[PDB]
Amino acid sequence: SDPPPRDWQLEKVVELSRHGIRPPTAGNREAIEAATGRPWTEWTTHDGELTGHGYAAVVNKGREEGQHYRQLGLLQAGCPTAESIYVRASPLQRTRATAQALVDGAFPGCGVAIHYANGDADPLFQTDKFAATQTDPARQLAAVKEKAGDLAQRRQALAPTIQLLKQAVCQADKPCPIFDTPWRVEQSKSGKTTISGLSVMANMVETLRLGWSENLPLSQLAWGKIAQASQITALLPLLTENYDLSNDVLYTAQKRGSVLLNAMLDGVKPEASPNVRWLLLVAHDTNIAMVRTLMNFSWQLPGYSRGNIPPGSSLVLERWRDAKSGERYLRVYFQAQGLDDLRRLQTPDAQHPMLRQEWRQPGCRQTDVGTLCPFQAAITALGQRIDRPSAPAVAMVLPK
Amino acid sequence: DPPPRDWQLEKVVELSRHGIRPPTAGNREAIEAATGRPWTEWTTHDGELTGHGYAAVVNKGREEGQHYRQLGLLQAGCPTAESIYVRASPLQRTRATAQALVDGAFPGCGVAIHYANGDADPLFQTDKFAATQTDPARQLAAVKEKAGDLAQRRQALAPTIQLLKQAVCQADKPCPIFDTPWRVEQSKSGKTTISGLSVMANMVETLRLGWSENLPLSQLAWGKIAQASQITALLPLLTENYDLSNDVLYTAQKRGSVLLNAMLDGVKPEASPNVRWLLLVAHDTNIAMVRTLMNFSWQLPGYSRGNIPPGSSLVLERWRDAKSGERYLRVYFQAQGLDDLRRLQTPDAQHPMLRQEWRQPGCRQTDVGTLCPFQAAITALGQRIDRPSAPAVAMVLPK
Amino acid sequence: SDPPPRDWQLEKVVELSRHGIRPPTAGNREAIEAATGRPWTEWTTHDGELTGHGYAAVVNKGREEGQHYRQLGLLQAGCPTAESIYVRASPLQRTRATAQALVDGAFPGCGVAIHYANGDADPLFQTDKFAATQTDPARQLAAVKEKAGDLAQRRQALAPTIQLLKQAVCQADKPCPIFDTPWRVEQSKSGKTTISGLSVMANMVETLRLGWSENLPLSQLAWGKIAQASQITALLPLLTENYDLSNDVLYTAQKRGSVLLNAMLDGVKPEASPNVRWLLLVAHDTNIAMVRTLMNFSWQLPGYSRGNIPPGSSLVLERWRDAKSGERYLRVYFQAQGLDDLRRLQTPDAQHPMLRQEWRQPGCRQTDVGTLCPFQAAITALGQRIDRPSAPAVAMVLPK
Amino acid sequence: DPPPRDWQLEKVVELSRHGIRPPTAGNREAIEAATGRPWTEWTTHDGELTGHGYAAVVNKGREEGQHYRQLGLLQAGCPTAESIYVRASPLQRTRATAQALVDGAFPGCGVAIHYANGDADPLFQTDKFAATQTDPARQLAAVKEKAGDLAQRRQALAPTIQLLKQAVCQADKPCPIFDTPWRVEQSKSGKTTISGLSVMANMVETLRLGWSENLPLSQLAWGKIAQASQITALLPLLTENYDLSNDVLYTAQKRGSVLLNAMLDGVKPEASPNVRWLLLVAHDTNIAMVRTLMNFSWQLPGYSRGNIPPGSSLVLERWRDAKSGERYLRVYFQAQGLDDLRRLQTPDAQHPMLRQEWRQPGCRQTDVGTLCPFQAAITALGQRIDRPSAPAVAMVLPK
């Protein structure tokens, strides 16, 4: 490495990470097995929990990240103190274990603890469980229908991708129910709004992507039908489509993601509590999608479709200072590993770097540390779509 | 006086312990009763392979794959059916460890592992098969005979017991286990244990595993243990318990002969399956019985005599000198150190695996390690095998 | 450690180190053996070369120093580049080997090279070998006599210390010539000005101090007569006195030290060549004494007399920046290890820290990183006594 | 089946190599002639102990002192006349290494070392004493007999020779040594060498020492060598040369018997001097002859068979079980790894010394290592000693 930058100084990191690789959730399994009329692989990890390979991949990212932040002088050599980091994970096993993996890698052998809510609902993450942040089913129905438009036309436009999925998952000369169902907007008794057909197809594509990333034997991924990363990439358009029509619907993102984006923007400002160098939040792709929608931030990384959120990927806000003037800037980016890098447990070292895309707007400047945006203007732009009634203050430090 | 050599590695037979787990459900009940307090609940289910445990096993498997490619045992790239066969005990923790090993050794290659359909593999769960079960009266006598004066044994380990008590007992509260005399105990199903000692051994294994896991110190032993040397100081209790259980010769003969026999058969030419690397993944109890039958033990840095760390393994290597055509066996045990496990250090050139080799007269020092004339080595290693307890198994399972 | 400072940023280090522990020089030995009428211990190291124990002690300081500068974010993690450091050593073996020891410690296993002049004279260090920087014997005679004043009175005032030295080094009922010689100003045929009696006594005290620091057996240090560090400390007043009347004479320091102080002050300024994070110069106590005299900087560290310069000790200038404004400051200090720490090869970790004294003047402020002085005013004050004709520009990067 | 034990370490006898040196003057002449080019001039005089070498030895001695205090062999604080006696070969490099060891082991204690007044110590410079010199005709025959077909030996090491040539030869220039057939050569004073091989061995030792020294890569092998594995790959040439010189049994018997005899006598009770630790500091040639008489060799991570790194040592430990009163011998060789030396890594719990133990039938694994019944061990270790070449020496020198 070259010596660390002096003219630019990193002050604060706020990071929102997805959990690492998991098998399908119990609900996902029910759906995909019904959709294809056959059982899918049972993994060595319990459905919905972080797999060992998932933990290992997250450690690899955390290790390179900790080295990077020591190199830049944000963190101390050796083990951290309370001033170094605060980790808040969604209370699910998969997110707690992912949070452990990140600090396990970033601070080798340091026994760094994580924090999570006592109950099974954290108001930053399980926003459908709190009055201020719940959607109204009637509004969500309208919103999804408005964005979806002609669903027959969307289904026809995805026909080639649907065909690739069918080839991978359907048994020769057997019923494959899901490919016969027309795409329509449906609501559950709890008022969750999904698209018939597409939503379960999206569950299938995520499961295949996760199985690829896991390094499952090919015989156990899609019955030997998928053998290269490009074949996963070709399926991802269905997942993007489902996201466009669920988590990335503005109404839904405003109701269910405003509290988290608000917490993140406040967290990157000076005078944040807790007073730490790195605030690390670990949650779900749902949360990341809603936040990036409110940010109006879109990405497309090599080997992935638009907006894809891989396991152990993260959205980062960094506050930087021009040391020649004290003027503050924000850097905003999304990072992930590629499909084969995850499968191979490749460390994201200098030669196989993380995939990354930075947000920008007029007035941002390209520096040796990344794209830096005047701080207040960046905060204002990123926060425009926040629904204030849906963004109550949350104490970041869990009482614990 | 070594002759001209052209060393070629022909076959590896490896018996690995599973990686790091939290206490088993049974362990937890015993240790929580023994100390009168709850112990940390890990993010991994009791008895399963932890994420950190998986990561540490990947690291070992990655360097091992590189090594055996460098030696020409394994071809470049992904393996074939002739490269490797992996058989794991059917428990989640052993299945998951088997996966981690080939995940590291053959990056991104989707290498499968194999395990029994039921809850019992006749190589590993040997107490579930008549031919390989101990007789209760014979086992009781063997354990009594080896234990001798247990009051003296307990008094001899007093400093170690005190260190354990300091770590796990609450000030000004009862701590039941430390008040129990050590006595032989035998269950209705025939399992012989030592009262006091055996539960203390469970406690020490739990603390060693929690250290190796990189648990926060507050959740390891309530902040009382902060360095690896404090774990090392407790391990004599684990060695003592092993001496009086898995390492009792009679027990090892009944419950371990089938596995050692299978390993010695696997390392000979014409083995089924025909693979360059036979990888077996099981439990410390299995390794302990096997090494006892071999009359082989070890002492590695930071560990007590015969300690079997998570992800450690016993290895048999068959070597040929391509010039003379003579064949040799190399036998060793390998593990990572305490801090290396805690830190997820990959075992590279600067941080090598800890290793000790077996030898007997006739063995020679070579550029590839201690190599022993093959026939004499297999014969010597099999001398303690109890023939009626060694039925031949099919190594390749159904699928 | 706590996280590195953000409001204060270290930009540049310029360091002038003494060589590490050596046996007496060949000249020293001749003098001290004549002075006491007996042979002194022959060390395992050649006279005047860096001892192995000396190298080890210097490595210990370099190792903690490299860790410190990575912690503060001046240096990169891992091995350095050309931008990290430039090391220029006096061409003597003792100074080359000391320079190697410092980077050996600071950058473990990195094979960092050092630089030194092809000949046996470097114009920053062997200043008596270059026309612009040589003293005139007639002026030096006047200068030493002026400062020395009544030498009989100085000798009488040091009588208790002289007695302690006699006790350590003189044989019972044998001639010890040096203690009979009156103190007078003398000049050699080359025009070097020394004080008779005192100068050789100072040679003796340095040799004893170095033998203590070396961990020589007590039987080989002063024939068993010195057994604790306090006994070395008690002798050091003679060394301070000799320094006051040689290297610390203003005239001499101006002629022979201006070129080096000038190079050092220019080196800590922005726009210095070479463009490096750390300029490390390795030379002799003579050079350090002249420089601190020109700086008007005096120190007294625990266990040492005023101005003492221990083996492997150094004078440091650091340029710091207030990251809230870009305003620049200078920190100036002298550092060493204590006598027992050197003898024991103690690493100067957090629990046995380097002994240090900082320079200051009105306007300096105490910060969490040390005493910081407004940069231009500090440069001006430190440079007041430079004799400009004696301070020619020197290319810092050796052609080489 | 171990009995109750209370292990007490009673005596250590240690034979250490000197630490890192540059090439000797003689080495430099040979290697510069062999490659037709000047080699780096170090800041240390040819053949002397380097500053880095001193520092690395201090590190080892520091951890060793701590260890032997922890075991109760050495009292707390500074030693007494009964704690240690240090005898070094009279060369600067060995005297300086002896100092470094006690400098580390007993911080700030002014511990003295001892050496012969002349240029020859009868334990170490054995060729300078009639009883312990080889006969020229017998030595020539022994070396010829072991060497056999040297053309085959040279052809067998061709890949290694090529790696050396790539590191040290200038492109498009003559490199004399690589064009010489390997032949037995005997000087007028009786010294037997192998043409080609012996100078290549000098080159490999120089490169290994330069690596260990932390020389800039540009000054090591003109930038051609950048990692430890490249040094490891060259070491077979050093092993080959040792096999045909210091490790020839006849040679070792004549020139090594006096030293092994003194070591075995020193490790027995009632030794003179009465000290807890007898420390001898000499040369790789001495260690090689001693281990050959012991029929003991090793292979440590990153090193070829029997390699003797700078600051490495052979150790004999006499242990007593305080319960039974039985006595045991433990025998091992220890060294630091290549990167550890280069980096001046202290050998702490996380970076332990590399070690291999000797054993024979009857030895047992214990909590303090491989321990061998004392009388049987000393007898077995002394079996190859040539009695006429083993006069008794006074261990304590005049001063």
Ligand SMILES: [Mg+2]
């Ligand atoms: Mg290390």
Ligand code: NA
């Ligand atoms: Na840093």
Ligand code: NA
């Ligand atoms: Na689209």
Ligand code: NA
């Ligand atoms: Na659990």
Ligand code: NA
């Ligand atoms: Na004075």
Ligand code: NA
């Ligand atoms: Na030299």
